[PDB]
Amino acid sequence: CGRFFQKHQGTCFYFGELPLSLAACTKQWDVVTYLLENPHQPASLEATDSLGNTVLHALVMIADNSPENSALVIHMYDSLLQMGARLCPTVQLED
Amino acid sequence: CGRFFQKHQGTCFYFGELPLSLAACTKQWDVVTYLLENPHQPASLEATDSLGNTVLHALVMIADNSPENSALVIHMYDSLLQMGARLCPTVQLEDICNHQGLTPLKLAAKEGKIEIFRHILQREFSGLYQPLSRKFTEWCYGPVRVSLYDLSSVDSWEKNSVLEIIAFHCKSPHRHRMVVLEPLNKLLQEKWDRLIPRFFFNFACYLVYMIIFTIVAYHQPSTFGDSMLLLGHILILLGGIYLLLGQLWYFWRRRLFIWISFMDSYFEILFLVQALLTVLSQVLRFVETEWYLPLLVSSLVLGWLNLLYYTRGFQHTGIYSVMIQKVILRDLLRFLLVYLVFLFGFAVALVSLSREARPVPYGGILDASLELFKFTIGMGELAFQEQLRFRGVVLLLLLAYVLLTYVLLLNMLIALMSETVNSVATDSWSIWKLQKAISVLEMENGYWWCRRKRHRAGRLLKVGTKGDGIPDERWCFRVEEVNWAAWEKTL
Amino acid sequence: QALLTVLSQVLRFVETEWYLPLLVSSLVLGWLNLLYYTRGFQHTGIYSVMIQKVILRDLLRFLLVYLVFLFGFAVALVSLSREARPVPYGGILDASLELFKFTIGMGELAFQEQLRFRGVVLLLLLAYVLLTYVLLLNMLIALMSETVNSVATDSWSIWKLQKAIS
């Protein structure tokens, strides 16, 4: 949580203030998988930042109306939802 | 150097009057290389012709807006620059003063070559030939890019900048497309955002001045009141003198601008006329001449119409004034010509055939024209004059004039403006940006009595190192932009 | 409208002369308020949407330029209408009224013989008439012609949004 990472009118870039959120926002599917089933310390997929946004919220925030950005956001959202189905099936991330 | 090789209006072909320039201009890269590292006698790459142009200048001169020509010129320019990097690295070929005192960038800006201008303004190279670049990248954390455009001889802080050349020296028809491409863009917006206060202060001063003008012109004769009237009159005289001096200084400073652009300003001449009329009326009052009031009233009208200069501060109304100008210039004059010819032709006729005694209308050439203009406005008295037995001829003439004028010319005028507005709705924004750029450039200087200090644009930043010693520094202009397509390929 | 109606009703008890203007203004505003309920049909709701777009896009720039021009000419005609060689253009209110009449199509463009500034007054009147009635109004027609064609595409979605809000 820093001025460069908080969302405001300036020279910032909001991604969710979470390493998993940063990995998801940067079209890096190789690290997202490794962050979730690493034996040592898995990263919770329902984790939240100071603002309250989650990974799906962070994906929504960085979304634009550009075709490539929209495709990236849609694909990452679907992949993250499908992965969350196979890790925490007793809780839904949409709600 | 011959008549066929000198640049003029004829059957000539200018290439630079140098064998190396000829080789470069003819897309012959095989001979250009051999001319530079031949052991016997190498050809200097910084050589100049009689006109003063160099190889890069010659490439700029032959440049057009055609895609193939633009590609050829760009490729040859880049290749020649890269070669000059490896032959004479102690001297840069970009900074070569022409006889008229220009560089390839300034020459391209003046001649109107848009494509080579945009290429030179934002050119980027790879790791090799890194110093020979204008656009850079400081940090690209995530999908955001920080572009560092070079502000060398393009910032107004220098005496002869590219912006000033574009504004006041370029005679190309569509020169407004150069103030909306890259760097020159953001820079002008940032300058205008800081020059807002002075612009609106000048507008407020002019508004107060003309408010005083109107109050004085209203309360005038056909004590305290006389004292206030005298104070207002002397204030108006001083204001008119100030405006006259300012306009005279502007015209004297930019004498070679009226011929280049006789209508792009359109308001400095109007301000000059208004100030001259005000001063003339004020000085003529002392002569006690009856024509004081008409001059004062005309000056008041012109000055009150002059407030539309200051409407170029908003996105919405500046374009409106631009379309006003386009409509006035494109289809108002042809209609006026045809209308005046038709009106005179009919007025002379009605005057001639209005003398049969079987006050009378159409007594003179002034009355008939007035009646026809009334017909145009919607107040024409189309009646059946019973005092002369040419009733039928007069009525038929009136109907013939009415049909073709009120039913055909005016409706066609409406249609013509309907076409013109749709046609010029695309380039009006660029013309407004050019007008704002001209206003910013004029406000960068001070008044005729106080020269403002220039504030240098951009900032000095670490950009590479010169290939012969310690790092070099140049002034850049940061611009951040969030692009995902640019970011997604570099992975 | 409701505030004006209530204010007029309560002011009647005070026995104030300005009861009738308030009541009449409230009546006008309420009768114009019936165009809210036209957003129930495909045909007229879009018409009201284009009405709003035309009012917002090109009605205000024209009004600004027109008011500036009208004031500039009215002050002039008032100033130079005092030569004795009732008279027209006596005050700033009369000259503006005459210029508006010119705009409507009822302007009395005559040759006033009671003052020897006939030429100056006539030239000023002609200069005002040309640029106003021949240039600004026709250009306004063209501007609405452009605006209607431009907003003919998104008007349906705006009408759907209005219906959704309702």
Side-chain angles (χ1 to χ4, degrees):
Chain A
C1 55
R3 298 291 295 164
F4 176 58
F5 307 117
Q6 294 187 3
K7 184 177 181 293
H8 60 84
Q9 178 188 304
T11 57
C12 64
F13 167 63
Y14 181 78
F15 60 85
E17 325 178 344
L18 282 169
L20 175 57
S21 297
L22 175 54
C25 293
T26 58
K27 196 181 180 180
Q28 285 181 234
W29 185 247
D30 291 331
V31 292
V32 172
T33 46
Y34 182 76
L35 284 171
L36 303 171
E37 66 271 14
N38 77 90
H40 320 298
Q41 183 62 255
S44 163
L45 185 47
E46 69 207 341
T48 192
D49 56 21
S50 74
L51 189 48
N53 288 3
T54 188
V55 193
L56 302 180
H57 297 197
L59 281 170
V60 172
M61 294 299 291
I62 76 179
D64 290 346
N65 300 343
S66 298
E68 61 285 347
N69 191 358
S70 78
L72 184 151
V73 169
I74 281 168
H75 199 315
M76 185 63 72
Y77 195 91
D78 290 328
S79 292
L80 280 177
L81 203 60
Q82 292 180 358
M83 179 87 48
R86 289 185 286 112
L87 271 75
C88 51
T90 74
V91 56
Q92 70 276 16
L93 315 177
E94 290 291 330
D95 303 359
Chain B
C1 55
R3 298 291 295 164
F4 176 58
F5 307 117
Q6 294 187 3
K7 184 177 181 293
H8 60 84
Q9 178 188 304
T11 57
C12 64
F13 167 63
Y14 181 78
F15 60 85
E17 325 178 344
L18 282 169
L20 175 57
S21 297
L22 175 54
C25 293
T26 58
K27 196 181 180 180
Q28 285 181 234
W29 185 247
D30 291 331
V31 292
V32 172
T33 46
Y34 182 76
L35 284 171
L36 303 171
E37 66 271 14
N38 77 90
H40 321 298
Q41 183 62 255
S44 163
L45 185 47
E46 69 207 341
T48 192
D49 56 21
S50 74
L51 189 48
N53 288 4
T54 188
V55 193
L56 302 180
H57 297 197
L59 281 170
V60 172
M61 294 299 291
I62 76 179
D64 290 346
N65 300 343
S66 298
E68 61 285 347
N69 191 358
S70 78
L72 184 151
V73 169
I74 281 168
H75 199 315
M76 185 63 72
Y77 195 91
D78 290 328
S79 292
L80 280 177
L81 203 60
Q82 292 180 358
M83 179 87 48
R86 289 185 286 112
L87 271 75
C88 51
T90 74
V91 56
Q92 70 276 17
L93 315 177
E94 290 291 330
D95 303 359
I96 289 296
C97 292
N98 204 353
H99 286 172
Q100 48 187 355
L102 279 82
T103 55
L105 186 46
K106 295 178 186 170
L107 185 48
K110 182 175 174 66
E111 292 287 86
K113 326 290 198 191
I114 178 69
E115 298 298 326
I116 185 65
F117 171 75
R118 70 174 65 250
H119 164 90
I120 296 191
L121 200 61
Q122 46 190 356
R123 71 159 174 251
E124 213 172 2
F125 287 162
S126 280
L128 294 174
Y129 319 120
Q130 187 66 36
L132 299 176
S133 184
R134 312 277 291 199
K135 182 172 75 175
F136 294 95
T137 295
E138 187 173 1
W139 54 270
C140 50
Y141 177 95
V144 308
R145 271 87 180 92
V146 180
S147 299
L148 272 70
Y149 291 90
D150 191 349
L151 288 184
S152 189
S153 71
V154 73
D155 182 13
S156 294
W157 191 86
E158 190 66 27
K159 179 70 174 179
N160 196 2
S161 61
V162 163
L163 285 171
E164 184 177 0
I165 290 299
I166 287 164
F168 300 110
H169 284 80
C170 196
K171 67 180 71 65
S172 292
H174 287 314
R175 65 184 173 93
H176 51 88
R177 292 194 178 104
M178 285 191 214
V179 308
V180 85
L181 14 85
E182 215 23 286
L184 293 7
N185 206 350
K186 302 294 178 68
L187 188 45
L188 294 177
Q189 185 48 38
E190 179 268 343
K191 274 197 191 146
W192 169 260
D193 277 359
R194 297 180 68 258
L195 275 172
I196 289 294
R198 181 168 292 111
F199 181 84
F200 280 119
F201 173 63
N202 288 120
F203 160 75
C205 289
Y206 189 69
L207 181 59
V208 169
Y209 163 74
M210 210 62 166
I211 277 170
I212 277 157
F213 195 89
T214 284
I215 300 299
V216 164
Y218 191 88
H219 289 72
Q220 75 168 3
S222 285
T223 187
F224 190 68
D226 289 331
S227 179
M228 295 298 102
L229 180 140
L230 185 64
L231 188 153
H233 275 101
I234 62 170
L235 203 162
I236 297 169
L237 182 61
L238 297 194
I241 290 297
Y242 178 98
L243 267 296
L244 191 62
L245 291 180
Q247 293 299 317
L248 282 191
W249 179 57
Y250 166 91
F251 277 108
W252 161 261
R253 156 167 46 96
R254 308 211 180 266
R255 57 186 70 86
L256 275 296
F257 183 41
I258 301 97
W259 292 353
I260 282 165
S261 296
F262 64 91
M263 254 297 297
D264 287 85
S265 55
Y266 179 40
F267 270 96
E268 273 76 354
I269 193 66
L270 268 299
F271 274 55
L272 178 64
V273 171
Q274 199 265 343
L276 183 63
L277 275 190
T278 295
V279 165
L280 174 49
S281 67
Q282 283 309 327
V283 66
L284 189 62
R285 184 190 66 183
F286 292 165
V287 180
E288 296 296 327
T289 300
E290 190 69 25
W291 297 85
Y292 158 59
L293 183 63
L295 289 177
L296 185 70
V297 161
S298 180
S299 177
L300 185 151
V301 163
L302 200 59
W304 268 116
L305 297 182
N306 279 342
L307 277 296
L308 282 71
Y309 167 75
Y310 290 103
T311 190
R312 62 186 66 186
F314 304 105
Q315 177 69 76
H316 197 64
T317 64
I319 295 175
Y320 183 53
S321 295
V322 166
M323 317 192 102
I324 284 175
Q325 181 175 178
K326 298 287 97 175
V327 166
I328 286 174
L329 294 174
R330 281 189 74 160
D331 51 356
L332 186 69
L333 299 198
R334 298 176 293 175
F335 167 84
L336 279 179
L337 189 143
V338 178
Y339 185 75
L340 288 193
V341 169
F342 276 41
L343 192 152
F344 187 88
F346 273 92
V348 162
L350 278 71
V351 169
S352 178
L353 191 145
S354 68
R355 299 175 182 180
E356 175 167 32
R358 176 156 74 186
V360 306
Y362 315 107
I365 193 66
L366 274 299
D367 291 331
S369 290
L370 216 51
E371 304 294 326
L372 299 187
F373 200 70
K374 278 177 217 174
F375 267 104
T376 297
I377 302 301
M379 287 279 315
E381 293 83 3
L382 195 145
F384 208 82
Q385 320 283 357
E386 64 292 352
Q387 69 275 17
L388 60 85
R389 75 171 286 272
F390 283 141
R391 298 176 293 173
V393 168
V394 161
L395 187 61
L396 269 294
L397 260 68
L398 272 184
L399 295 176
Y401 171 78
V402 164
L403 185 69
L404 61 83
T405 290
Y406 196 88
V407 182
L408 170 73
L409 269 294
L410 204 69
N411 298 44
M412 182 179 71
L413 180 149
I414 298 187
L416 276 192
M417 287 184 212
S418 290
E419 178 191 4
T420 296
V421 166
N422 285 317
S423 295
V424 306
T426 307
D427 288 331
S428 55
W429 186 72
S430 179
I431 301 170
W432 173 61
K433 299 300 286 185
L434 180 55
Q435 281 181 345
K436 185 189 285 185
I438 293 189
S439 176
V440 163
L441 270 171
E442 284 287 323
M443 294 182 286
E444 201 92 358
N445 295 317
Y447 313 113
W448 59 271
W449 50 279
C450 178
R451 273 73 173 176
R452 273 197 59 253
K453 62 180 295 273
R454 297 288 178 86
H455 286 147
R456 200 145 197 247
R459 67 180 65 252
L460 190 61
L461 290 187
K462 168 70 173 177
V463 164
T465 179
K466 64 182 181 293
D468 54 55
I470 46 174
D472 56 350
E473 306 293 357
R474 73 185 55 166
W475 281 68
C476 307
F477 177 65
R478 288 179 57 251
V479 59
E480 297 188 357
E481 59 89 20
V482 183
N483 195 0
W484 300 85
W487 165 83
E488 62 89 21
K489 65 178 72 66
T490 178
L491 61 86
Chain C
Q1 199 265 343
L3 183 63
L4 275 190
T5 295
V6 165
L7 173 49
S8 67
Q9 283 309 328
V10 66
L11 189 62
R12 184 190 66 183
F13 292 165
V14 180
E15 296 296 327
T16 300
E17 190 69 25
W18 297 85
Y19 158 59
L20 183 63
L22 289 177
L23 185 69
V24 161
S25 180
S26 177
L27 185 151
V28 163
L29 200 59
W31 268 116
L32 297 182
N33 279 342
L34 277 296
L35 282 71
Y36 167 75
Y37 290 104
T38 190
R39 62 186 66 186
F41 304 104
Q42 177 69 76
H43 197 64
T44 64
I46 295 175
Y47 183 53
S48 295
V49 166
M50 317 192 102
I51 284 174
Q52 181 175 178
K53 298 287 97 175
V54 166
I55 286 174
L56 294 174
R57 281 189 74 160
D58 51 356
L59 186 69
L60 299 198
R61 298 176 293 175
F62 167 84
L63 279 179
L64 189 143
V65 178
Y66 185 75
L67 288 193
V68 169
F69 276 41
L70 192 152
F71 187 88
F73 273 92
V75 162
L77 278 71
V78 169
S79 178
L80 191 145
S81 68
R82 299 175 182 180
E83 175 167 32
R85 176 156 74 186
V87 306
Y89 315 107
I92 193 66
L93 274 299
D94 291 331
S96 290
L97 216 51
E98 304 294 326
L99 299 187
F100 200 70
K101 278 177 217 174
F102 267 104
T103 297
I104 302 301
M106 287 279 315
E108 293 83 3
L109 195 145
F111 208 82
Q112 320 283 357
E113 64 292 352
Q114 69 275 17
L115 60 85
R116 75 171 286 272
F117 283 141
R118 298 176 293 173
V120 168
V121 161
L122 187 61
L123 269 294
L124 261 68
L125 272 185
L126 295 176
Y128 171 79
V129 164
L130 185 69
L131 61 83
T132 290
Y133 196 88
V134 182
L135 170 73
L136 269 294
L137 204 69
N138 298 44
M139 182 179 72
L140 180 149
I141 298 187
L143 276 192
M144 287 184 212
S145 290
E146 178 191 4
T147 296
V148 166
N149 285 317
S150 295
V151 306
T153 307
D154 288 331
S155 55
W156 186 72
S157 179
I158 301 170
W159 173 61
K160 299 300 286 185
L161 180 55
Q162 281 181 345
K163 185 189 285 185
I165 293 189
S166 176

